[PDB]
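Assemble and predict.
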Amino acid sequence: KAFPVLGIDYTHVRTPFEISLWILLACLMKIGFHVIPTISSIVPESCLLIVVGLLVGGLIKGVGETPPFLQSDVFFLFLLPPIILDAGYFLPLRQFTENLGTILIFAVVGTLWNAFFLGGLMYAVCLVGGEQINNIGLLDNLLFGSIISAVDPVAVLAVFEEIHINELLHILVFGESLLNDAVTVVLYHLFEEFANYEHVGIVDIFLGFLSFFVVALGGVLVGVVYGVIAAFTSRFTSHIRVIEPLFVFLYSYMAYLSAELFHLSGIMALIASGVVMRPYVEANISHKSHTTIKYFLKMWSSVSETLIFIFLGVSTVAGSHHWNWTFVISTLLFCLIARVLGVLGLTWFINKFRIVKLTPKDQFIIAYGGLRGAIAFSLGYLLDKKHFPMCDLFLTAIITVIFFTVFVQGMTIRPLVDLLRSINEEIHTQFLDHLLTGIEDICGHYGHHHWKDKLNRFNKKYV
Amino acid sequence: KAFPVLGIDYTHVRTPFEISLWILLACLMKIGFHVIPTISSIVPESCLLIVVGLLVGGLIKGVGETPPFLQSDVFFLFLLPPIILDAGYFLPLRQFTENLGTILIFAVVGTLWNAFFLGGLMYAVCLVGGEQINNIGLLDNLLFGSIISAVDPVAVLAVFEEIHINELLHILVFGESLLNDAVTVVLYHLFEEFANYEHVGIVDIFLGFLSFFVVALGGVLVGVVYGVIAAFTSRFTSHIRVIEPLFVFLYSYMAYLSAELFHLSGIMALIASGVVMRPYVEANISHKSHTTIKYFLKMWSSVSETLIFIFLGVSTVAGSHHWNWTFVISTLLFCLIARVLGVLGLTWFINKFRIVKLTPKDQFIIAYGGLRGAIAFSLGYLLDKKHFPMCDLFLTAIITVIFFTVFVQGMTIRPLVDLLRSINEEIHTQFLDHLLTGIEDICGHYGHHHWKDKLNRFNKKYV
Amino acid sequence: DEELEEIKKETGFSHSQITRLYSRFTSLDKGENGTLSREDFQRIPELAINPLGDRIINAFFPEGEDQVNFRGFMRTLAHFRPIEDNEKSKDVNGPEPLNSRSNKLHFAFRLYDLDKDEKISRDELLQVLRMMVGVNISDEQLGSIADRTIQEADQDGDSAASFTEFVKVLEKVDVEQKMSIRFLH
Amino acid sequence: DEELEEIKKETGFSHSQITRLYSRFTSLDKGENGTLSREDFQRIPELAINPLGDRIINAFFPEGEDQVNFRGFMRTLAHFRPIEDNEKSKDVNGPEPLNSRSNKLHFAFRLYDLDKDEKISRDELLQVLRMMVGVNISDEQLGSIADRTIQEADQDGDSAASFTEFVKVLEKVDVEQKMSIRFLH
């Protein structure tokens, strides 16, 4: 072996080198996606991720490499918490807690409605469907409904602008996307366990109903504990500042792993930890370190979403498919109907319980514009084959729903929704505002203003 | 199983959770290391890393967990390139290329001298040592000498200040640490392959001599190729700016993996890629993104060094030890003597070939102050047991050398070296400067000024 | 059940809203004899912090009397009851409801006006602005803001154009959303 | 071998340094007859860019003659030869070497001085400063800098204190390192 060291050993660097190649290709298409004059405001970013995944999967198929896969430990530990923490860190806590009621209604109740409505209707279709969609059952199909209701409406916000997206709809879709990705994972684990009980009684249904809230709220509690710890330890990192971002990421990640340790909701723990630490940081942290934290979250979430959509591409062009016309067409149509019915019903229920109503503009955007991706696919991809023997059909339905809801429901929402400050004003605005508040404080109904003032008193006390 | 989802599954989150715990402990000690009034300027940062590793290893030993280990793929692919890229990115290219001759002399030639002098003297000791250090041989012992000469003098710069560290000594130790970590890894792979030839002839010695330069310069060539590519693609990332740091990290990492693919010097490729891209970025990249890149490199290198020193702690308090008094004492004494002799001889050789001589101050700092760590340990820890049956003795010697060179040679260098601008001046300075230059341009000797002016003409031409 | 219907006709609330308000009333009574007075309002923890706080305490009161009965509290508080479209839309004869688009901005003018002389003036605007803003900001700054608002608002020419123009410059500002309170049952 | 020893005594170089310099000399001769002239120096690519470039071309020249021979180039260039301690230290009688701490700063003064009248003056400083700095910067700025340097430098009282004080304010500035060139063999 002349020239001893020299070699061409490529097995040593395949996973890191090819993952770097994928992230490089996705980044190069992003810098080839914002240079086209007006295309970032016509087509969502998720479409670019889909197309990048399709090209990478096509390259993998053409070369002949065995396509890589999510290990169901890399997703739930290394690829999910980036996305969740990026989403739930820059949550506008003011707007989020002002109308927290409607956000919780949409996210939790609308996600449960989507999940159970899709489960029931897909079960009804399977019962009366061909011999290759029978024997799916209820729990195996209700789990599919819960997976496919993991929806990301906030991507549609990229297609709009400051106009048509008020501070109400923006926070509504933002919180809906967050807590929907939380509730769908909670339901995913719940149904994935219920699908091996072989006897689901009423007592088991009640226990699952309790465990839903126990998982979610235990995640919230772990998150606030780690957020308080991060808020405290951020006061002392003024001496060494390149460690300031690291403490935020470490404490959020440890909150996620402490929630997932006890099988609580890691996503809700991540969200709660970020939301708790954010106000008490950015005041104890320098501007440079806060700007970094922002950049870190953005690009690390972008890398994670890129990787998820690359896996989607490689499993849609180079994977196993079990296309069923009845199941796939029914799931497309029923996802649209379940989403629309949930949005309409819940908006009707909550307009009468609030001051600022939800216009048909934002009702249409929420109902038509909730687009799947990067969590629906990954949740439906990590389904076992031993359990859920039909999981290839579920993957085909989920991929078709993602493509239809991103390319047809996201590329045809802006050209489908536009067709369906004097000095006085300022003075008076502040005036009416101080007026209403005083009045609300006189009547006394314990709305949200009272709670926020109590929160502020608590904050002062701590400080 | 009441409350279905709830569980206490900890095997799922052990590696991520415990690595997060370790990084959190190291960060908490860093924010407990800069709050003590005057201790960051008395004891180096490497001592804090050693102590953090010792505490984490002690906790692992006390609990009873099986101690984790470097997989020799995680180090050379995920833990080394952070450190190398952080070091070689903020390389002050001006000062580095001004006196490039002396930096290359120290790094390459002094590292080779340290490696071969330690190999020869340790071989001489083993030949006349006890029956448990015989049969080590030359190549197995010359490899140990090359591993233990992976030295990091720049850590000592933390103990000094702007005074006592001029722009010459600072760049000298910086480039020495970089290219020493490069040359020691090149020699490590070279000797680790030569240790299975069972017949090393003169033709094999010459082939290894050629392959040293082939590996190093092929790494440099791959690095400049990827640096040119990154410089080009940085012109177009103005539209999307959260991807600007990602392109730097991706292109440097791909340079590293392309060099390691062909078994070339990945470290030199990383250094060359960073050095090439840096001038042509930070001009095409916004200030926020450059500040991020800086923060990313600093904290990601800090995490990698933390992890390496944690592994050092767990393998020194909870590992296998083969302490030999002759070998360990001889290697301590001979590391000190080899370092001192190399520094003295090379400084004497290069003072006569330059204008600004090296004072006994900086000669003492380079000779006494080159402290091992985080690459010496890791290189000497990934040695096989099949090959190199004595590798436990090598690990014990390397750990002892790290502890002695960090705690005795780094804590007793500041209290061992302090005891052994009118308007005119400014005008005249610039004047004499413009004067000398003109003169050097008249005489014509092709020094470095000429080369730099040619480089500038080339840069203009490109732009 | 007490007498509630006549206020349920005068104000226009429902029964549960009135019951909850009367509950808060009894809680804030801190004594039956001071059914409701100025000090009774002043010792509410938070409104006194509000810059307009004192004006709000005297804005309910019809005349110089220092006592408010429950029914008068209802009459003054109804001004905020949200405008209900079909129910403002069902029968049209006279503006019996006090929560109208007119009465809602009239409460604003009565809160601005020093006395019930319908005179918003540079003194009035300057006083309320100095209340809403802190004491630190320059009087010349407040002078500029207040007199600029007077100038643009005044189409009367006497710098007043007080109510009729108040409505016109606030018409651009939806008050149906801005100034109304939903009182939970 | 040509005549080299007498320059090796006059200048104090070694033999290889002189050989390499003569090689560069022949390369820059671009013709034997113009052994070395003003234009011959001007067409060197880079020094003409240097602000002091023209002064350096006329600084070698002893007198108004427009030709430089090789030996004169050696005499003028030796001024930069690095001071060698033991070899400046071995025999002490008279300052035969021109590379001394005195002659090195005398070349500087001869480059500043307009003529060889030893007169650094506000005109001299202002001219050289306007050369080193660009043309954009204010003449009042240059006036401030130049006259402040004159004031601090001048202990003569005539604003000159030209050479004797030049040495004193530059003594704080090591010229042994700053102004000398090692000529590779």
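The first helix of chain D runs from residue 7 to 10.
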